Enzyme design. Sequence first.
Site, mmCIF file in Angstrom:
data_model
loop_
_atom_site.group_PDB
_atom_site.id
_atom_site.type_symbol
_atom_site.label_atom_id
_atom_site.label_comp_id
_atom_site.label_asym_id
_atom_site.label_seq_id
_atom_site.Cartn_x
_atom_site.Cartn_y
_atom_site.Cartn_z
ATOM 1 N N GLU A 78 0.826 -1.199 0.000
ATOM 2 C CA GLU A 78 0.000 0.000 0.000
ATOM 3 C C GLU A 78 0.874 1.270 0.000
ATOM 4 O O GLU A 78 0.709 2.148 -0.851
ATOM 5 C CB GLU A 78 -0.911 -0.007 1.230
ATOM 6 C CG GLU A 78 -1.798 1.213 1.335
ATOM 7 C CD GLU A 78 -2.822 1.273 0.221
ATOM 8 O OE1 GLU A 78 -3.833 0.539 0.297
ATOM 9 O OE2 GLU A 78 -2.603 2.046 -0.735
ATOM 10 N N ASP A 82 1.348 3.870 -3.283
ATOM 11 C CA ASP A 82 0.965 5.278 -3.177
ATOM 12 C C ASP A 82 2.068 6.239 -3.633
ATOM 13 O O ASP A 82 1.821 7.162 -4.416
ATOM 14 C CB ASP A 82 0.579 5.611 -1.731
ATOM 15 C CG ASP A 82 -0.599 4.790 -1.228
ATOM 16 O OD1 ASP A 82 -0.853 4.819 -0.009
ATOM 17 O OD2 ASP A 82 -1.276 4.123 -2.038
ATOM 18 N N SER A 278 -7.088 1.934 -3.951
ATOM 19 C CA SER A 278 -5.930 2.517 -3.270
ATOM 20 C C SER A 278 -5.022 3.256 -4.248
ATOM 21 O O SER A 278 -4.328 4.205 -3.877
ATOM 22 C CB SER A 278 -5.097 1.428 -2.585
ATOM 23 O OG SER A 278 -5.771 0.862 -1.479
#
Length: 357
Positions: A78, A82, A278
Amino acid sequence: AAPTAYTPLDVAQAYQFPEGLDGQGQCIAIIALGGGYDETSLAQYFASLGVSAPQVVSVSVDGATNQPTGDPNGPDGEVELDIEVAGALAPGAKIAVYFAPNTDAGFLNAITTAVHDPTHKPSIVSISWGGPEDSWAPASIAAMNRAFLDAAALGVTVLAAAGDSGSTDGEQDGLYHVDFPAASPYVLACGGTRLVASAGRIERETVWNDGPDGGSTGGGVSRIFPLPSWQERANVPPSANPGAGSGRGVPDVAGNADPATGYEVVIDGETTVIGGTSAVAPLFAALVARINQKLGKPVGYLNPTLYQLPPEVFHDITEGNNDIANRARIYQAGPGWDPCTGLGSPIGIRLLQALLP
Ligand SMILES: [Ca+2]
């Protein structure tokens, strides 16, 4: 049928991000409640894409720090997803990653610290963590919503992923649910699609729905936040839950999220494919960074403006549904705004042109 993947630059090209802008003079804040990132993966990735590596710094909130676990299937996935998506598309911007404990207070504190930071001064905040709005303590929902309201007042844009478990958002209580912070009216909620595109055109874009096993975009009608004045002309339907009820519609916009047409990234040294909503928040955070650079002033809170812009600014998704629990097809995509993809995927250059004074 055959699984595929794109580099972030390919998706930005499909969505026509404005050229010659890289986010110079801007700072993007990323919130992280676990894991971390390693310089080796980031350096390799940015070099591989031919972009000048953006400055990335870590900020400790409530004692939390940058601590990668090393497992490409864990939270590092994650955090690095990002940074890589946002940094590859806005390499001229500075990236500040705020690490906090995985608690309600940590989440809130990370947000407020980023928003009011006099050293890093971010103009954009990207959030890829969340949970069912109705599973949150009401006091926490109130505090976080006010933090988002304060950000809007300060001219800081806040984006959040809408969820990866369809219209039921992972709950098995016989009801439909939307995710928070995406549900906040002060956040730009980012939904997910299955994108089939090439450099010059989008061949097909539908609602991301790979069933219970593969995930689906979050989306629906809030049971906590009233329908915003600026969203009253979007034709948000009443909730599908018995008793109906009007509420803030989720999401606001949508972008490629289907792992079957996912993002090629490097996590803990491993080149792999990751998807989910995400990836959409940082994708659009980079877009906003480019727009801000051109305008010379931050766009801050965008929702009201977006819903009054001409529809030509967005690519309307009309096919598919985000139901992974039963055969009722709740909710379904269709012409105009819908509870699967909102206004659709943005056309970068048209959005910038429409925002020019
Ligand atoms: Ca639509």
